[PDB]
């Protein structure tokens, strides 16, 4: 008996299959990189604009400079002379609760408050007076003073194409309400592609609501930030590989050493 | 102080994101889509369309070739040991570079190397057999002549069909003619065709001197190319697993020989 | 400009090193040893022999488990597929986790919970199973009361004859007689046995208050026994798989259900 | 056919196996971590001075501050709310020719200097004529007047109790030159290791030269670096965590932005 399963690709026959799709169907189709993932990812062959969002989310999510944690570990290995999949992959490795893999969380708990019915004051005192953080909103330099870009292509693209938007529209409520009481606490690229993907499942007709519930359940939108970085890291280890810059060492005078006395 | 990290890919520092010295919105202005953002970001270029339109489907090729190959099943392993995302995907993507997703560029490497030599294709197979080196991006387990691989005919038709020139790519189909000659499946394989025409892309499509494009090669950009698009895939393989309730994995002593010393 | 970063465990500004107050000599000199040093490193203090030589040996107990366990079958692959040891060993240090070797962190605290409170060990059991939870630290793939694990025996006879206190354990124990006694493969697993123990070690031996004690639970230090133990046998994979020449692996597709969509 | 071959543990029985040795005989003769790697790694029994000097390799190995390449990822990825296997990996991904991972290639490259017959002075010049940096040799903040304790210890011990050390005194003769030429080009931990790891395994009588060149070949000597390094990584790991430390973001001002126009 076959000790694995799987149901996504198959390499064995005559062409290659994504999904029940033969290669060369899906580029008869013209179903693009987004139309590959929907293919991959979630088992369908998603409607245009879902591709193109998905594509969208891929372009607007490649990079954001050196300074973020996993890009600046990207350069470290870099700079040590480590391979490409080394150093993309330590970079990678810093994505999760606090940096780029905020996404389902963000769409789980903006889903479970829209659905519960509470209203978004509600929502953020409630969060509030329990000391959780909102995940999707906030940012270290990115705010009301210094609006993100990429937010605003994601929203205008949203409004245009999709059928129904009522998670965003109700995060974008919350945002009214979190950046008047701090200036960042913007709903960030994280928060924004979380909620526009629970709509995009929710209502594109390609899925019922346990199989949305299920693709947010097991991880799939963080998957579109990982995926979407990868490009910028692997930009970022060729950029530090032409620049010729040699091992890193963090100088002493930003560190404060504070080891244990009397021992 | 002087600045310790130097940088020329991004600037977010702004009102509004730059990609290249192109800001964000323009990127999509001038419809570039994830090509042209590679373009921007791995090499600092607005590439021609018809450049960008290839690099996608580059990546939608390569996005999977099943759950067997190496760095699908690790990633499979992790995900059934109830891993989160990335874990999963990195243990994956850290069987790539040597036996597993290099040919890519081995295959761009050792073509442009006999191209750049000035020998022409018959020396070339002559000179890695009496070298006893396999030509790398050459052959297929049953492929041949009139039974092609659907992956290379589309993206060879392609390249065809909108590179101004090919010359990388003329001398790799030359080599297949003569290795074909001596055993039917050695054709041009996905990693032979891919890695001589992203070359030719690099040299021709006006955005590069040859020692720009040499210089993206020697420093992997078709290893980037291999990682970029499989992590689609590996991806896949992560939730598929979940999707399918795959417990814990071990593997059967049926299945292992253990010589340990006496 | 104030400091990033902060940082108390080893100071390497000096002429001598230093490991948590201490330079490095004297660390020597008072034949501090791996357990020694890792007391310093991971929790700033000094502990009693019997506590460093106890985390020697845990390192030792869980140095390898062979290759079919999903964290070496994981190395074993990319090791052949030709890749580095540091790729290798790191594609399968992420396995570890929730099912495979990284229920040390939970185990105790599940278990430290329970005995705090004074539920009895079959209330902890019967609200485990009748809530569907799975007791961390509690059962195996191949070890059972049938085939019972060497490695807890050894740690048990060690904790049992030089620690002063053992109620973690005596509690964990009482537990496994109920569990082993409903399915003969619900042991105190390695991970239970050694995150148990050393619960007992944190609160008794002196060094650390009981707040302390919980925080290094909470922060998730137990798993680093294994994950640092661990190492060295997959270390020692990859360094087997290029001395008995293994190629390129592929896992067999009779070996795997394809069921696609229609 | 089996799809799988393995030569070093044994768990399918009752009692786990070590490389032929069951579990309560490791313990029975006191092997320790040294034993337990020369059982797991290089497939012998050790000479107790093996092992010990296995067992200081990490213990001096272990931590060497925040600031270097490995711990200022794993500190950031610690800062970034992973877990500590992440973290971890992220850090140990960074040792390589540059950082830590030099023990191969200073132990091949001093190993075939010595052999070749070349003298430590047309050694140091014949690398500098052919623009080769000497593996083993170097170090950002450790000089002549900045010694590396460290190594002062590894050299100490292997004096006292190795039975030959003629690579490790060929290396120490590279040194004397390399450190009159800058004072920078010490002999680092990772090419003492390296060296003496040489000269332990063609000198301690379990293994004949073949086998010694085979594991210099293989790569095992930077895996000590490795294994002892995790301690420290691990560490800063939890402190990071018990100093509730968050997100880190590199300042804009160190870092020179040179986009095309
Ligand atoms: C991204 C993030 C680390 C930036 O935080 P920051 O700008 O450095 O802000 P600080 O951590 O200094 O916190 C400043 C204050 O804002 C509050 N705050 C920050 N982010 C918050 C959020 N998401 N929800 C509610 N309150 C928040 C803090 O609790 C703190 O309040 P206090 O003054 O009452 O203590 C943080 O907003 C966050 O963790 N967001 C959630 C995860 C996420 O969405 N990440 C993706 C963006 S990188
Ligand atoms: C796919 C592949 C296994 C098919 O080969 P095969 O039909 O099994 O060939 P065999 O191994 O049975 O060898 C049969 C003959 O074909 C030759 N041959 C096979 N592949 C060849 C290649 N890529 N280039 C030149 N000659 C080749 C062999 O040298 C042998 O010649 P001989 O009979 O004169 O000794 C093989 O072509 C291959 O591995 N190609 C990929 C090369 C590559 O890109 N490798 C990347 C990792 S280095
Ligand atoms: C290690 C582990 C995967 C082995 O599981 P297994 O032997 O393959 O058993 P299965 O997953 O097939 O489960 C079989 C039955 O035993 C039960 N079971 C298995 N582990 C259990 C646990 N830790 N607590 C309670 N019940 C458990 C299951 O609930 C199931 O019960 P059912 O017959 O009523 O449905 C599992 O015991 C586990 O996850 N343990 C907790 C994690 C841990 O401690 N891991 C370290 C050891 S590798
Ligand atoms: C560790 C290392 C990166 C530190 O370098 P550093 O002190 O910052 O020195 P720089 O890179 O600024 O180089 C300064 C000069 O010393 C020379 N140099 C540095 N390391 C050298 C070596 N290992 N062999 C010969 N010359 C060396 C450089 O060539 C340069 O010479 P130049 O001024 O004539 O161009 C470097 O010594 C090295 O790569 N060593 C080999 C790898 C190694 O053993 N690493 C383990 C220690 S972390």
Same mark, same amino acid.
């Given at each position: 008996?076959?000790?694995?399963?799987?149901?996504?690709?198959?390499?064995? %026959?005559?062409?290659?299959?994504?999904?029940?799709?033969?290669?060369?169907?899906?580029? +008869?189709?013209? $179903? @693009? *990189? #987004?139309?590959?993932?929907?293919?991959?990812?979630?088992?369908?062959?998603?409607?245009?604009?879902?591709?193109?969002?998905?594509?969208?989310?891929?372009?607007?999510?490649?990079?954001?400079?050196?300074?973020?944690?996993?890009?600046?570990?990207?350069?470290?290995?870099?700079?040590?002379?480590?391979?490409?999949?080394?150093?993309?992959?330590?970079?990678?490795?810093?994505?999760?609760?606090?940096?780029?893999?905020?996404?389902?969380?963000?769409?789980?708990?903006?889903?479970?408050?829209?659905?519960? %019915?509470?209203?978004?004051?509600?929502?953020?005192?409630?969060?509030?007076?329990?000391? +959780?953080?909102? $995940? @999707? *909103? #906030?940012?270290?330099?990115?705010?009301?003073?210094?609006?993100?870009?990429?937010?605003?292509?994601?929203?205008?693209?949203?409004?245009?194409?999709?059928?129904?938007?009522?998670?965003?529209?109700?995060?974008?409520?919350?945002?009214?309400?979190?950046?008047?009481?701090?200036?960042?606490?913007?709903?960030?690229?994280?928060?924004?592609?979380?909620?526009?993907?629970?709509?995009?499942?929710?209502?594109?007709?390609?899925?019922?609501?346990?199989?949305?519930?299920?693709?947010?359940?097991?991880?799939?939108?963080?998957?579109?930030?990982?995926?979407?970085?990868?490009?910028?890291?692997?930009?970022?280890?060729?950029?530090?590989?032409?620049?010729?810059?040699?091992?890193?060492?963090?100088?002493?005078?930003?560190?404060?050493?504070?080891?244990?006395?009397?021992?």
């Amino acid at each position: 008996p076959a000790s694995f399963m799987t149901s996504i690709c198959d390499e064995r %026959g005559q062409e290659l299959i994504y999904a029940g799709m033969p290669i060369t169907e899906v580029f +008869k189709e013209e $179903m @693009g *990189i #987004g139309g590959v993932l929907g293919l991959l990812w979630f088992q369908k062959r998603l409607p245009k604009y879902s591709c193109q969002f998905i594509e969208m989310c891929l372009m607007v999510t490649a990079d954001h400079g050196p300074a973020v944690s996993g890009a600046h570990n990207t350069i470290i290995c870099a700079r040590a002379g480590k391979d490409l999949v080394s150093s993309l992959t330590s970079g990678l490795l810093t994505i999760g609760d606090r940096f780029g893999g905020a996404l389902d969380a963000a769409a789980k708990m903006f889903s479970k408050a829209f659905d519960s %019915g509470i209203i978004p004051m509600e929502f953020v005192n409630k969060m509030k007076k329990e000391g +959780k953080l909102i $995940m @999707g *909103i #906030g940012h270290r330099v990115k705010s009301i003073n210094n609006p993100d870009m990429r937010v605003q292509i994601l929203k205008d693209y949203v409004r245009q194409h999709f059928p129904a938007t009522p998670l965003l529209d109700y995060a974008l409520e919350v945002e009214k309400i979190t950046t008047s009481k701090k200036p960042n606490l913007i709903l960030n690229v994280d928060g924004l592609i979380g909620v526009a993907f629970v709509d995009m499942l929710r209502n594109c007709g390609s899925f019922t609501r346990e199989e949305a519930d299920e693709y947010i359940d097991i991880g799939a939108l963080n998957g579109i930030f990982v995926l979407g970085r990868s490009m910028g890291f692997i930009g970022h280890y060729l950029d530090q590989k032409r620049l010729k810059q040699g091992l890193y060492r963090h100088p002493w005078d930003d560190i404060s050493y504070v080891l244990p006395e009397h021992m």
